[PDB]
Design a protein around this ligand. Structure first.
Ligand code: SF4
Ligand SMILES: [Zn+2]
Ligand SMILES: [Zn+2]
Ligand SMILES: [Zn+2]
Lengths: 135, 196, 131, 333, 98
């Protein structure tokens, strides 16, 4: 009477993909009724087919998610460090720098945005008639 | 529901996976699956406490891949509370990605260009770096060795002479591994995206 | 090799100002940024695998015809035509001699492009120029 | 309009009909079949039947309209096209469109059969000037030049293959070229030139081939760099109109090509194609347009203008440059 | 069906729109049936093909069907062909077996 009738990696992928929301499925609950699933989860993570959240005390599988993107790891650590090192320019000044560099900018500076009688003798019949000012 | 939205979504997913860790993918994917997510809802979805979500949200806000929106709420039977929502601003995310990619490529190109320049010199004791031009005015009266001004000790040649091929390989690897971003950016620039 | 430098892999999309030049020695495309980085200091080996010809910085020039092979033929023809300069009048109206002379020049250009008899062809070219 | 072959007649393009009809009647197929009956090359029964009967007895004496001519030919299993063309000399009155009298491509052959002293009548001639202007014109697009390079590359590959198996075929033609024989002498009556003479017959040079294009490979290189030069001129970002003389001068300065070799481009290409005996000319059709351009621009100098416009259709997102060799003088043709 | 130009995709109908492909297939079959040899006196295909080798200057855009910025057909020719098909259908239907 396992909560999720999952016993093979193919079945796990089908269940995760069918999820309507992004709420994860607890590996603690999934492991119940499955004699071994940590190896399967780790193998799938290596294949980059499922997203896995792991504990901090020791690497241990937890809530998993369907991977809708490409390879989880595709960039060398050196380039990741370089990406972190670069500091983004001023929010408003970024489009100007991109245009100067020769690249078409997809955004614009927010500062450029724009934010946007005499007595009436006809007495008894003053109200019944509507005002047809134009035609 | 134009394909342009899907292309931008693919660009964000690839960028996050390739240039950010694991929890970053979880946070940004949730706000990509759900257009707007409250701070409380995001925590429940990923089952991560406030402290863990702290660095993720802050880092993604710094690169402008995510945007914040604070508004006051008036629940029918509770005190007014200021809620926080996270959503993706595509024009800024694309612009931030484009500039950051250009900077990384330019930085590597500059490093490759600099390495081809003459090595230079540095003092072993005070660890002060002397350029080729600067050291040429420090050689002793005997024209034998360069003497440090502070230490009055012979200088030692600088390293990185043989790294010329290493930098070229690094540049080649980045461009090979960054091709999907360039292709996605080209497609995005071809079409037009409305501000979100 | 579509729109980027094979050496530094600099794409035109990221750096639209990038331009390329070719040295008549091996007709190898290379961006001006790499040319300044490498050949400015002095002559050096061409930075392609399997290519070792020494090429100077000044000899670099822009490419006119897109087809690389046609560029080689024109430049070789330019060199040959400088040495070989004759007109119909030079032969005193002998059309047959003029046609034969033109055919021989074309054969020389074809041999140089394919390098069938580069040693002999170059020697013959040198002799005529001196004479 | 006259083909009766079930396969060729079904073709939707007049030029495609000519290619198929010529293949079955060029005479190469018949000679090959005679040499080896096992050969699978087909023929045209309609054309073959004409050989048995004499020319003077192709049709009974009288007037034969297209409907009547087709009916008789179908009954007798004969080709109306060959009967009509071969009977030009015998006819007392010949009726044909202006394109058979002002367009040199399909007029030089016909004009030789009609008598000099014949009475010429132009009916509905209020638009004749358009025909004359449209006969010596030509338009080249980016696609045309792209296919020209493909055809030249294919031509070079075919020549190399022909050289490997047997080079005697090319040697015989080269000897004839040195002797001064042109296409008319080399080609037989049954065969037709691959590229029709685009310029008027009187403006064709009578001297021998220059020599730069005598060899099969030298002409290919001559054709190749000419195509590249045209591709270069397509990149102009603004309209440029110039006389043929200026175009030739700039051509010579960049890629060494003279006026005289260009004038023989159409003639030389036809000989090379015939020598190679290519069964299919689908790829080489592009080279035909380039050959026409070279002869037209290298023959006339007054009354013609070369206009290159980057935008053929102004309402286009991406420019599609087109270069037009337009004839301004309606009286030349 | 009535020849009105097909504007940008509107609400239309979910179910009936699915038959558009079938309707187009029927139109192609009808066009093939209508096509037949024409009397040589009024035939116009031969006139344009009377000189198969003519390669004069291409006519201006005023003598060609209108095209959009992307280069796709404007769509006016489609409705014009519908008028021809409708008239041909009416005239052919007159010559029935009865
Ligand atoms: S010979 Fe006449 S019938 Fe035969 S293919 Fe040619 S045009 Fe058609
Ligand atoms: Zn020191
Ligand atoms: Zn480079
Ligand atoms: Zn080289």
């Amino acid at each position: 009477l396992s909560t999720y009738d999952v016993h093979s990696p193919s079945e796990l992928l089908k269940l995760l993909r069918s999820q309507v929301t992004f709420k994860g499925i607890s590996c603690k609950d999934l492991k119940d009724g499955w004699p071994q699933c940590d190896e399967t989860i780790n193998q799938l993570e290596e294949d980059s087919k499922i997203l896995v959240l792991r504990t901090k005390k020791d690497k241990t599988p937890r809530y998993v998610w369907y991977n809708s993107g490409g390879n989880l790891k595709c960039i060398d650590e050196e380039f990741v460090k370089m990406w972190e090192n670069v500091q983004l320019p001023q929010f408003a000044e970024l489009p100007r720098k991109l245009q100067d560099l020769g690249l078409k900018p997809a955004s614009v500076d927010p500062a450029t945005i724009k934010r946007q009688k005499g007595k009436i003798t006809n007495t008894h019949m003053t109200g019944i008639l509507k005002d047809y000012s134009h035609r | 529901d134009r394909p342009i939205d899907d292309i931008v979504k693919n660009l964000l997913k690839f960028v996050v996976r390739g240039f950010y860790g694991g929890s970053f993918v979880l946070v940004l994917d949730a706000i990509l699956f759900h257009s707007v997510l409250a701070e409380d809802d995001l925590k429940q979805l990923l089952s991560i406490n406030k402290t863990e979500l702290g660095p993720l949200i802050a880092r993604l806000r710094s690169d402008r891949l995510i945007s914040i929106h604070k508004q006051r709420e008036y629940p029918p039977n509770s005190k007014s509370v200021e809620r926080v929502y996270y959503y993706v601003k595509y024009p800024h995310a694309i612009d931030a990605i484009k500039w950051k990619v250009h900077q990384v490529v330019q930085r590597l190109k500059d490093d490759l260009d600099k390495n081809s320049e003459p090595n230079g010199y540095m003092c072993p004791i005070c660890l002060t770096k002397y350029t080729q031009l600067e050291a040429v005015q420090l050689l002793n009266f005997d024209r034998t060795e360069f003497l440090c001004s502070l230490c009055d000790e012979p200088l030692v040649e600088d390293d990185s002479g043989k790294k010329n091929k290493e930098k070229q390989d690094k540049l080649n690897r980045l461009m090979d591994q960054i091709q999907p971003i360039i292709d996605s950016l080209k497609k995005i620039d071809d079409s037009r995206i409305e501000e979100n | 090799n579509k729109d980027m430098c094979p050496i530094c892999k600099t794409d035109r999309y990221l750096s639209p100002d990038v331009k390329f030049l070719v040295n008549p020695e091996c007709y190898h495309r290379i961006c001006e940024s790499c040319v300044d980085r490498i050949f400015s200091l002095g002559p050096a080996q061409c930075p392609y695998k399997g290519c070792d010809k020494i090429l100077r910085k000044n000899k670099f020039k822009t490419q006119i015809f897109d087809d690389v092979e046609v560029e080689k033929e024109v430049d070789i023809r330019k060199r040959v035509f400088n040495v070989f300069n004759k007109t119909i009048d030079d032969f005193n109206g002998d059309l047959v001699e003029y046609n034969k002379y033109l055919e021989e020049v074309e054969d020389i250009i074809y041999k140089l492009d394919h390098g069938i008899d580069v040693a002999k062809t170059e020697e013959k070219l040198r002799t005529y120029e001196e004479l | 309009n006259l083909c009766l072959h079930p396969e060729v007649s079904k073709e939707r393009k007049g030029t495609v009909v000519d290619e198929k009809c010529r293949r079955m009647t060029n005479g190469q197929a018949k000679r090959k079949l005679e040499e080896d009956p096992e050969a699978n090359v087909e023929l045209c029964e309609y054309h073959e039947n004409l050989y048995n009967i004499e020319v003077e007895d192709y049709l009974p004496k009288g007037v034969f309209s297209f409907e009547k001519l087709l009916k008789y030919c179908e009954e007798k299993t004969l080709c109306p096209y060959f009967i009509v063309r071969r009977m030009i000399s015998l006819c007392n009155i010949i009726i044909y469109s202006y394109h058979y009298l002002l367009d040199p491509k399909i007029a030089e052959r016909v004009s030789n059969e009609v008598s000099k002293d014949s009475i010429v009548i132009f009916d509905e001639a209020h638009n004749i000037d358009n025909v004359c202007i449209e006969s010596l014109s030509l338009d080249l697009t980016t696609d045309a030049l792209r296919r020209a390079t493909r055809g030249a590359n294919a031509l070079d590959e075919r020549i190399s293959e022909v050289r490997k198996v047997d080079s005697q075929k090319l040697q015989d033609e080269y000897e004839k070229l040195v002797q001064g024989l042109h296409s008319a002498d080399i080609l037989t009556d049954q065969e037709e030139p691959f590229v029709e003479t685009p310029v008027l017959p009187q403006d064709l040079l009578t001297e021998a081939i220059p020599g730069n294009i005598r060899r099969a490979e030298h002409f290919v290189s001559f054709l190749k760099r000419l195509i590249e030069y045209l591709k270069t001129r397509m990149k102009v970002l603004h309209v440029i109109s110039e006389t043929p003389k200026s175009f030739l001068q700039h051509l010579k300065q960049l890629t060494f090509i003279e006026r005289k070799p260009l004038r023989f481009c159409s003639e030389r290409l036809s000989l090379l194609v015939r020598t190679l005996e290519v069964t299919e000319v689908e790829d080489f059709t592009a080279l035909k347009d380039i050959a026409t351009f070279a002869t037209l621009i290298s023959t006339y100098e007054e009354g013609f203008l070369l206009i290159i416009e980057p935008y053929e259709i102004e309402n286009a997102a991406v420019p599609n440059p087109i270069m037009r060799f337009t004839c301004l003088d309606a009286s030349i043709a | 069906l009535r020849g009105e130009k097909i504007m940008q995709n509107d609400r239309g109908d979910v179910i009936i729109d699915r038959y558009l492909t079938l309707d187009q297939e029927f139109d192609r079959k009808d066009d093939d049936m209508l096509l037949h040899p024409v009397k040589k006196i009024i035939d116009l295909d031969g006139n344009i093909q009377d000189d198969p080798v003519v390669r004069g200057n291409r006519p201006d855009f005023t003598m060609q069907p209108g095209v959009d910025i992307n280069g796709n057909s404007d769509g006016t020719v489609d409705i014009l062909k519908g008028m021809n098909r409708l008239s041909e259908k009416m005239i052919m239907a007159l010559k029935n077996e009865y």
